[PDB]
Amino acid sequence: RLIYTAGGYFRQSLSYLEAYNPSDGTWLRLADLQVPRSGLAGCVVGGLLYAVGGRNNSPDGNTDSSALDCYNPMTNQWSPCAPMSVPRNRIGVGVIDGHIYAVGGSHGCIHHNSVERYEPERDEWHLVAPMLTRRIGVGVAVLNRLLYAVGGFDGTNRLNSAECYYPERNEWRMITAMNTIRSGAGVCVLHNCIYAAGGYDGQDQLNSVERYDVETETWTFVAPMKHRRSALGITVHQGRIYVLGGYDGHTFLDSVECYDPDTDTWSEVTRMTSGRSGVGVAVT
Ligand SMILES: CCn1nnc2c(C)c([C@@H](CC(=O)O)c3ccc4c(c3)CN(C(=O)c3ccccc3)CC4)ccc21
Numbered sequence: 410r411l412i413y414t415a416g417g418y419f420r421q422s423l424s425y426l427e428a429y430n431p432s433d434g435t436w437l438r439l440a441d442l443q444v445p446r447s448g449l450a451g452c453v454v455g456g457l458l459y460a461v462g463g464r465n466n467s468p469d470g471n472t473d474s475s476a477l478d479c480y481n482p483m484t485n486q487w488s489p490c491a492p493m494s495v496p497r498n499r500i501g502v503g504v505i506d507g508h509i510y511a512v513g514g515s516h517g518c519i520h521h522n523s524v525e526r527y528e529p530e531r532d533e534w535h536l537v538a539p540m541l542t543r544r545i546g547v548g549v550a551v552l553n554r555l556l557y558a559v560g561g562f563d564g565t566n567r568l569n570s571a572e573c574y575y576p577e578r579n580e581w582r583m584i585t586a587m588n589t590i591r592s593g594a595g596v597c598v599l600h601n602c603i604y605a606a607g608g609y610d611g612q613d614q615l616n617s618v619e620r621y622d623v624e625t626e627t628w629t630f631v632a633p634m635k636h637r638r639s640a641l642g643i644t645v646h647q648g649r650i651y652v653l654g655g656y657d658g659h660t661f662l663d664s665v666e667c668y669d670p671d672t673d674t675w676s677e678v679t680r681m682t683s684g685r686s687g688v689g690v691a692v693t
Contacts, residue, residue: 410692411437412646414653415460415480417685418447419661422465426480427682429665431646434679440485446474448640450502450549451689452509454529457481460689462493462500462514473498473516477509477527477534482693491532493525499593499687501549503556505576510537512558513544520545520564524574538579541572546640548596550603552623557584559605559621560591567592567611571621587628589617593687595643595652600670604631606652607638614639614658618668632673634666642690651678656686 411428422445428437442460449463458480464473473496480487497514504510509527511534513520520543525534544561547568551557556574560567569590572581587605594608594615603621605628607614614637619628638655641662645651650668654661661684666675 410646412644412651412690412692413439413451413458413480414642414681415451415458415689416442416446416449416463417654417688418466418640419683419685421445421467422447422463423685425685429679431651431678436679436682438682440480440487443478443487443489444474444476446689447687448499449474449687449689450500451691452502452504453691453693454504454507454509456693457529458691458693459509461502461509461511462497463687463689464496464498491527491534493527493534494536495521495523497521499545501544501547501558501561503549503551505551505554505556510549510556510574512549512556513540513547513561515545520562538574538581540574541581541583542568542570544568546593548591548594548605550596550598552598552601552603557603559596559603560587560594560608562592567609585621585626585628587621588619588630589615591615593640595638595641597643597645597650599645599648599650604650606634606643606650607641607655609639613637614656632668632675634675635677636662636664636666638662640686642688644690644692646692653690654681654685654688660684661686
């Protein structure tokens with residue numbers, strides 16, 4: 410399985426789709442997105458890569474995207490799907506039982522607290538219960554068939570709070586807040602724990618990383634990354650966390666760090682073909 414990185418931003422929204430093979434250390438250049446996208450989120454359902462939301466910030470215009478596009482690795486083709494009810498720039502995405510949940514995001518200056526769910530076998534979006542907080546740049550993690558939305562930006566303050574969505578009950582419940590305010594951080598699930606890495610606390614870009622244990626209801630710092638990163642791509646591949654690119658306050662990073670939970674260590678493993686931030690990343 411490969412680590413796919415779709416879109417991104419560097420002076421403008423990008424159309425790149427590249428894939429990393431963690432065993433051979435090789436990079437693949439695949440079919441470009443039809444529309445350049447930054448601030449999107451990626452996910453995989455049924456071996457198909459999906460690109461949700463974001464926007465195309467160009468030197469000629471700026472349009473937030475309600476689009477859903479699905480890349481087929483066997484055909485190397487992007488195909489458009491049913492758009493969402495609203496444009497969702499800086500979106501969070503999670504997958505439960507084959508359904509793509511789209512969390513928060515912004516449309517111009519409107520910061521969403523609404524959530525919609527996509528059925529791939531019917532090409533249809535449907536609104537579910539809205540979150541208790543408006544969140545853009547929110548991280549999303551699926552654990553125990555529950556959906557966790559972590560941090561983000563509510564329109565006035567960057568958030569350290571987090572809430573949990575219960576699909577069978579269609580309700581949100583606030584959980585323990587993190588130790589650090591994080592917007593545009595990398596949120597993933599590794600070994601029954603929710604990891605949150607990097608982000609932006611309103612003043613600086615962070616290198617700190619904390620993980621949440623569902624049963625202790627406590628956030629715990631772990632070893633920090635070698636680079637400060639915000640708006641980074643994150644995913645899990647064979648028991649290790651990979652973070653890609655991001656913004657460090659000066660440069661757009663091309664570094665790719667790898668976190669091993671057994672030794673609690675971050676190690677640079679590769680570099681992308683160019684620096685970028687706000688990418689959509691998924692594994693298939
Ligand atoms: C500049 C200070 N700075 N440094 N870090 C910042 C972050 C994370 C944000 C948030 C918004 C906010 O928290 O109000 C935010 C969250 C998600 C996305 C973007 C921005 C825009 N994203 C970009 O590609 C991008 C481009 C350039 C720089 C950073 C990110 C992708 C998606 C804003 C401001 C921040």
